[PDB]
Symmetry: D2
Amino acid sequence: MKYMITSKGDEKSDLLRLNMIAGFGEYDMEYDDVEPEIVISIGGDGTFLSAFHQYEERLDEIAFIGIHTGHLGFYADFRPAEADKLVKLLAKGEYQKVSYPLLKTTVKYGEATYLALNESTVKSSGGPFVVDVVINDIHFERFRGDGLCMSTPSGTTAYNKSLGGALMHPSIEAMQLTEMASINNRVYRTIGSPLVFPKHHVVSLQPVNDKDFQISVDHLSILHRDVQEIRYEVSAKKIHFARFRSFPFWRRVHDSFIED
Amino acid sequence: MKYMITSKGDEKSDLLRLNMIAGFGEYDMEYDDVEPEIVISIGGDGTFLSAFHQYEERLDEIAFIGIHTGHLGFYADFRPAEADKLVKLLAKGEYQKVSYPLLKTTVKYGEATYLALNESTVKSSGGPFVVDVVINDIHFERFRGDGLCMSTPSGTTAYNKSLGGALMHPSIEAMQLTEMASINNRVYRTIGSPLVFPKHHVVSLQPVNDKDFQISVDHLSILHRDVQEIRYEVSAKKIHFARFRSFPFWRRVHDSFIED
Amino acid sequence: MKYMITSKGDEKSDLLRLNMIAGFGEYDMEYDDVEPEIVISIGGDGTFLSAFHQYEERLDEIAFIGIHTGHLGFYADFRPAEADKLVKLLAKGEYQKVSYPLLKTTVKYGEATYLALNESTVKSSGGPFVVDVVINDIHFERFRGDGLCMSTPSGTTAYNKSLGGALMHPSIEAMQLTEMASINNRVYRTIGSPLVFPKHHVVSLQPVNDKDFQISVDHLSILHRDVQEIRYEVSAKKIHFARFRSFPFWRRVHDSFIED
Amino acid sequence: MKYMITSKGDEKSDLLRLNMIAGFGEYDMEYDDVEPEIVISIGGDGTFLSAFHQYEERLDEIAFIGIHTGHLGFYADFRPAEADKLVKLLAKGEYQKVSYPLLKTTVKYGEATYLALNESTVKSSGGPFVVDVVINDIHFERFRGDGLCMSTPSGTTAYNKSLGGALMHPSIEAMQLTEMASINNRVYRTIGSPLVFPKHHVVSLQPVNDKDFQISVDHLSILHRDVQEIRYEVSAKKIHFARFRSFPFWRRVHDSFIED
Ligand SMILES: NC(=O)c1ccc[n+]([C@@H]2O[C@H](COP(=O)([O-])OP(=O)(O)OC[C@H]3O[C@@H](n4cnc5c(N)ncnc54)[C@H](OP(=O)(O)O)[C@@H]3O)[C@@H](O)[C@H]2O)c1
Ligand SMILES: NC(=O)c1ccc[n+]([C@@H]2O[C@H](COP(=O)([O-])OP(=O)(O)OC[C@H]3O[C@@H](n4cnc5c(N)ncnc54)[C@H](OP(=O)(O)O)[C@@H]3O)[C@@H](O)[C@H]2O)c1
Ligand SMILES: NC(=O)c1ccc[n+]([C@@H]2O[C@H](COP(=O)([O-])OP(=O)(O)OC[C@H]3O[C@@H](n4cnc5c(N)ncnc54)[C@H](OP(=O)(O)O)[C@@H]3O)[C@@H](O)[C@H]2O)c1
Ligand SMILES: NC(=O)c1ccc[n+]([C@@H]2O[C@H](COP(=O)([O-])OP(=O)(O)OC[C@H]3O[C@@H](n4cnc5c(N)ncnc54)[C@H](OP(=O)(O)O)[C@@H]3O)[C@@H](O)[C@H]2O)c1
Ligand SMILES: [Mn+2]
Ligand SMILES: [Mn+2]
Ligand SMILES: [Mn+2]
Ligand SMILES: [Mn+2]
């Protein structure tokens, strides 16, 4: 099988990467960073997201694995001392594949599309943020605030969590929308609660006055000018994970927020 | 088709009920309150929940319809002035059926089972509330607080909403757990975020010291003594709704919280 | 100086109490549990609150000291290994006094008054909770929910904190009101935010339908029937603390919630 | 008395301004926009804040009055139809003065000072926001998130409110700090609760890595580069309000968020 390794670029990660490559040479496994089937990320969650966006054109051909040399390592399944055992099990093909939903963002002018593994958010180019929120072509609310966040299931432990969103098991094919500091008074009104949307629903944001927005997708943040629409839907594409040990989502959540 | 009507018992509701019965007599529709196929509720959401728990043994044989003479009327599809048109459309059979998920609660001693349309909650019999939260047999957290709430999708606009939970579209077969005033300090720790569980997962609450709990199911509240386990799962049973007009969940939410 | 010691009644606390009494005998200090000037509490925060309510008639004649053999120990200034040094410093009179504000609750029928060191809360006798909230004789809101909490400054780290309230430095002579799961929809509306009231303001709760309420004051909880009014104001009375080492409130907060 | 009027610049406001000037000519009142004693603002709250920052060097020489031709008008005491009666009462000197606390922000490099009527906030220049929070020279927490907000009492109905802060009566000489989307996980920890600081306390923010910050003061937002410290304290200076009718803060709050 062809494989690649992405390193956080610190010393431990580079060297762990050199050892694993050397380990893989002992199994006739071709390192190919153009068309791999297995992508290993050595670092934290930012390094893993970078690895994901490097290969966003080949998502179904690839299965990902993270190694935790970072701080939190939510998407990681392995600590550095397991790295040698990873090489072995991965070479003999003893793993099963797990798929998590992804988020499609579309931006139109007067079209760009993006895939997010954690979330996509929207803020103004500076100055007040005001958008209308249209759900399946019904006008739902006019949002005044700092911004909005739309999150995948596995993204709900991330920025979504800090905004009061719910944590969502990734077997549920959904996306979740949360507010950033909404204004609510006599004249302005938002739902307040996060909203959880099923696979077949479309949430569109439409400008009211200013048409420039700071749009983010995972760690990337781009300015879009003269925007007509930002459309959110659950993607048809999925990320595949290589699992060698049963490591349930809720245990992952527990270890990351409660203890160990 | 056999049918029954439940009234809030105020004057408008009783009289609207008398008129509809008289209307139904003109179509050879048998009023039967033992084995109806259609149950009409005239009142608010409490009246509708009562109607639901009256027939919890016959859920798949029945389709429900609510008429709003109450205050909020979330589960209502009709205002009183449409009542005459309801009789007609229902008699000629021009409706489609919509199904929403339900919540199964099981309580064990040393077993009682209940079905909830909004939610089931747990509090202490007075004195401190402390439980361990076990998800799919993995121990997730020890909860110290006032109580916990587990909510259906259509229940998320209800008590769940007031506790900071997310609103959840009812096409998603899930249940959602939210905290009531959790204690978080140097020594005590909860997740904080609401949790959204898929159909196949089991959440069990297990006592730590006191074993008496105030358990609620929709409007009903019962004391249980010497409790060993409270087990939550998404039910295999569903509630069926008779729909004559397309009335999407998110429009229902909008009309109930934003305007009109 | 006359003194008393209250023990949590576990083995460590009783024995630490016996040693300190024996230590105090070496200084001609009269143990008097009727009219002490110094009250030492050995246990956690519940033990300290009990000690406070034991002497609520003699608040300005007494200065309190807590010793932490409990779990959190927010009101504690000493760990058990410092107990011997406490005896000494307290006998030679090398301490300064610190005063924190208290909360006055008045309940009227058709009058009972209470002093709270943490907070006083109000819930229904079971069934729905609905009250009007009158501030300085202006009608402010009608509250529908689970209950309300009114907290002293030093109480804001306690139940208030779990309800989203702000932490408040005790040099500020104020009381703070927070909601328990308020209902907010098209027809029902509360402020949502906690409210912070100055010394000279009066907040009165007035029943709407049910007139029986579960009223709490610190760890005590009493049923009141046929209630006409619950009136909250910042008390004229203060609790005095004996301080031997500078131990600022914000450091106390840090040690209790962030680390150490 | 010398006086000036600031207009929102829409048609109603300009014309209401022309009429009031003409009204004031009938009383020998000198319009002076250099050294007035009375500053009238015609518009919404943004127009009023602009009026405040225009005269921040002469705060004790001036008393402010707002006229509501905007949308919310929190700082307004008058609607346009009262404008004629305002001219009269203000000319005959029948008013009393009300003073609200202000917030001092100091920024140091390797000093700029600002006065805020609502709040001052801090965010990064793009990229992650990380600061240490030092209270009275004790290190309290390391904040990771989107930013922080420090608010006056009368500012607590504003941005503070949208971030979950408490509303604070302006007789309390305090400032309140609230988080913008803090990150809390196994490794990162913030207090979460808002913090309310008394007049004599100093809160200093100190950079950890990036030293460029987007700092706001009311409607103004400035980039500061190579920042060493951001220091918050309750100002010695106060804003004076001209009151002709008793209009209590809590009634103002009620009218702005509950109804009318
Ligand atoms: N106010 C906020 O909470 C906020 C603001 C902006 C971005 N973010 C998150 O930061 C992500 C990307 O930034 P970055 O990781 O490259 O730098 P970063 O600023 O260090 O990310 C912040 C933290 O989020 C963690 N994280 C990332 N994905 C997660 C997930 N699915 N579940 C739980 N935690 C997760 C990171 O873990 P590691 O320790 O392994 O790096 C890190 O601890 C965004 O996708 C976004 O979700 C959060
Ligand atoms: N702190 C809280 O928020 C709280 C506490 C206890 C119970 N509840 C809710 O009250 C329900 C049953 O009580 P009740 O209706 O008989 O008396 P209730 O006290 O009047 O119910 C409270 C309000 O919830 C509304 N409601 C019920 N189901 C809803 C839903 N699926 N979505 C949105 N709103 C909904 C009711 O609407 P109507 O105006 O049509 O009656 C009423 O406005 C419980 O199942 C529970 O969800 C809420
Ligand atoms: N949902 C909630 O958060 C909730 C519900 C009811 C009561 N309470 C609190 O419990 C207090 C009395 O109960 P209890 O202590 O006898 O039994 P408790 O149930 O053990 O008290 C709960 C926790 O609050 C802590 N606590 C008490 N006063 C505090 C303060 N000023 N600041 C920070 N933490 C404080 C206690 O500390 P220790 O470990 O030292 O005992 C304990 O960790 C009430 O006054 C009330 O504030 C909280
Ligand atoms: N996410 C947020 O909530 C957020 C973000 C940035 C700024 N702000 C607020 O906006 C203020 C300045 O902006 P702006 O007014 O010029 O434009 P703005 O964006 O229109 O201000 C937002 C709203 O805040 C209201 N407001 C201002 N001061 C208030 C107060 N003391 N109490 C209650 N509401 C108040 C404004 O009232 P009017 O209708 O009369 O204009 C407006 O409704 C800032 O000082 C800041 O407090 C809020
Ligand atoms: Mn990272
Ligand atoms: Mn009801
Ligand atoms: Mn205790
Ligand atoms: Mn404005």
